[PDB]
Amino acid sequence: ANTFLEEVRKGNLERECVEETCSYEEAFEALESSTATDVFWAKYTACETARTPRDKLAACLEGNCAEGLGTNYRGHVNITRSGIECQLWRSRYPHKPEINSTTHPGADLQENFCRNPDSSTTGPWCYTTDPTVRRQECSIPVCGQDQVTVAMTPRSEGSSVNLSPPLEQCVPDRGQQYQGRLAVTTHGLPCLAWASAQAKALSKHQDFNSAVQLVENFCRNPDGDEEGVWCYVAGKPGDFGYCDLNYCEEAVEEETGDGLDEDSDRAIEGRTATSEYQTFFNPRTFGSGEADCGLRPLFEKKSLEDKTERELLESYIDGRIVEGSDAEIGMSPWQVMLFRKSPQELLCGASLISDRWVLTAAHCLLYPPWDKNFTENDLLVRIGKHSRTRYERNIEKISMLEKIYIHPRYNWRENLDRDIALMKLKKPVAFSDYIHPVCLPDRETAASLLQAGYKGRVTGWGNLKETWTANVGKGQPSVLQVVNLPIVERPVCKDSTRIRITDNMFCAGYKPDEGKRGDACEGDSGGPFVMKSPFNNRWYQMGIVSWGEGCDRDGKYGFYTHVFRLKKWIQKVIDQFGE
Numbered sequence: 001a002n003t004f005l006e007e008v009r010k011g012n013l014e015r016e017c018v019e020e021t022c023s024y025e026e027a028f029e030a031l032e033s034s035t036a037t038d039v040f041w042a043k044y045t046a047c048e049t050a051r052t053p054r055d056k057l058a059a060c061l062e063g064n065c066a067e068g069l070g071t072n073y074r075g076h077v078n079i080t081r082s083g084i085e086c087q088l089w090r091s092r093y094p095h096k097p098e099i100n101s102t103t104h105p106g107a108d109l110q111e112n113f114c115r116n117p118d119s120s121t122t123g124p125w126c127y128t129t130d131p132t133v134r135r136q137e138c139s140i141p142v143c144g145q146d147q148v149t150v151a152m153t154p155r156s157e158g159s160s161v162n163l164s165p166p167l168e169q170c171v172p173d174r175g176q177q178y179q180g181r182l183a184v185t186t187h188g189l190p191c192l193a194w195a196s197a198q199a200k201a202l203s204k205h206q207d208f209n210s211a212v213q214l215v216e217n218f219c220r221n222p223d224g225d226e227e228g229v230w231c232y233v234a235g236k237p238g239d240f241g242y243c244d245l246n247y248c249e250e251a252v253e254e255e256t257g258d259g260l261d262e263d264s265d266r267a268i269e270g271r272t273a274t275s276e277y278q279t280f281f282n283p284r285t286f287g288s289g290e291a292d293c294g295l296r297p298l299f300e301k302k303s304l305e306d307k308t309e310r311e312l313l314e315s316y317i318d319g320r321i322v323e324g325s326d327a328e329i330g331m332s333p334w335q336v337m338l339f340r341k342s343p344q345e346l347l348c349g350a351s352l353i354s355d356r357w358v359l360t361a362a363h364c365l366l367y368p369p370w371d372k373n374f375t376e377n378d379l380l381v382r383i384g385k386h387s388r389t390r391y392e393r394n395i396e397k398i399s400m401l402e403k404i405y406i407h408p409r410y411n412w413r414e415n416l417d418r419d420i421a422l423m424k425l426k427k428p429v430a431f432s433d434y435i436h437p438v439c440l441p442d443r444e445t446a447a448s449l450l451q452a453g454y455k456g457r458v459t460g461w462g463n464l465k466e467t468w469t470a471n472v473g474k475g476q477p478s479v480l481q482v483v484n485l486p487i488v489e490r491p492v493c494k495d496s497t498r499i500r501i502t503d504n505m506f507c508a509g510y511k512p513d514e515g516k517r518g519d520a521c522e523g524d525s526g527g528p529f530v531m532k533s534p535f536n537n538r539w540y541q542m543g544i545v546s547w548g549e550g551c552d553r554d555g556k557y558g559f560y561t562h563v564f565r566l567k568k569w570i571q572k573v574i575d576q577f578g579e
């Protein structure tokens, strides 16, 4: 920066910049690259506190340690003060970082490592993967000293030495014959006695099993609910509440049929046996569309076989991966795009499972980290869509709703299991050949299909990836996505990620390859996992799209919430409107 004979000498970084005090033009010859000078000035903005010695400045530039407030950090440390795993700053889950290159580009926010662009006083910090914890300072070693920013106190798992373990075996029959003194709901609200007026009135009018033990006030399961035991409470009529227990991790897989012998070879097509749909709900209370659910009028009723229907056969050579293409119009009559009231913003997806009931993920209504809190007049639904940019009045309908029921056991803290939410249509949609509810299978039907070798059909518009993650380069495609996802068995599913595979979830997706990231993070928030049944000639919904692990880290599968256990729960809502 002086000694004009040194102006005959082209400036260097390590020379004029660190040790001397290089100008921006000196720094410029001293780095050439524009991004190099960008990072250079970001550091020097954060590294005036470490200008000298050269070790201080170099350690502040590199960022593999903590200097000053540590916003210059660029190391590998992905562990907070309390030890909660760091959230990737590209993934908006759990806590959506509005802080990126748009707000404070200098901090140069990395893949998963801690970052302090918004100048938190706690030192370098990272969004905690825990939804109950937004940020947290990390154990970032101080530049020039054997000191980390925070003493390492990881969140150790619960100690089993201080907890009294229950030695009761996990209750079968879904708590039908439970005898314990638990007379309060899952979260502690006490259940009324069955001798009370409302509980007795509900037992008299309902088809509650007599063999199921009807105790004074304890929550029971006389209707054969698969979600667990339950009870009614006083207040608004029809209120239902579970009473959580030591329920086993139960899946439809572990039941051995008494009619399907050991002859599993050469899958046999149904011999002129069209299944009579034994209706499970009453048409007066559940509404229309029950009997003829899940049939495309222009495809199955018109005898038109779609291109990718034959691709559901697992007998394909190695089951070659199917890429979702420009779908035919109206192949998904029950999918609904849930937009925000104003402005028109594609927020979530939902399933029109009946003529007056809509199933959507509870995440579409409440998630504390993203600050979403919805009322009745804050959302609109659009049913029968093919392209979002056009309102094709020729097919779709624009609707509002009138009531929404939140699943009581919605626990967003740990794993978003039981991601359940029901909605009632304010304006019933006139029947059409392009709109049709999808059937909800029973346990036996789902078990048969999983044992029938039919691959599922996953529908989505690609909003899942952009909602969960913020990668740039692949905007929203202009056509609907429909893919044939084979069912993944439980072992590879559990081994794929550290998130517990809860009792209400199963697997789906392709098997990933080395270097070739699959399409497991395609779809919409709150979407259904649809499958085809050659045994019933109809389509079924089995899973709800939950938070996918394929969006955060490479090579992950799809994990989705069980829905075939909802039937006994479903009645619990419709009697709230059938009284």
Ligand SMILES: [Ca+2]
Pocket (backbone or CB within 6 Å): 001, 002, 006, 011, 016, 026
């Ligand atoms: Ca110089």
Ligand SMILES: [Ca+2]
Pocket (backbone or CB within 6 Å): 001, 002, 003, 006, 016, 020
């Ligand atoms: Ca000089």
Ligand SMILES: [Ca+2]
Pocket (backbone or CB within 6 Å): 007
């Ligand atoms: Ca000069």
Ligand SMILES: [Ca+2]
Pocket (backbone or CB within 6 Å): 006, 007, 009, 010, 011, 025, 026, 029
């Ligand atoms: Ca120079």
Ligand SMILES: [Ca+2]
Pocket (backbone or CB within 6 Å): 006, 015, 016, 020
């Ligand atoms: Ca020099």
Ligand SMILES: [Ca+2]
Pocket (backbone or CB within 6 Å): 014
């Ligand atoms: Ca030197």
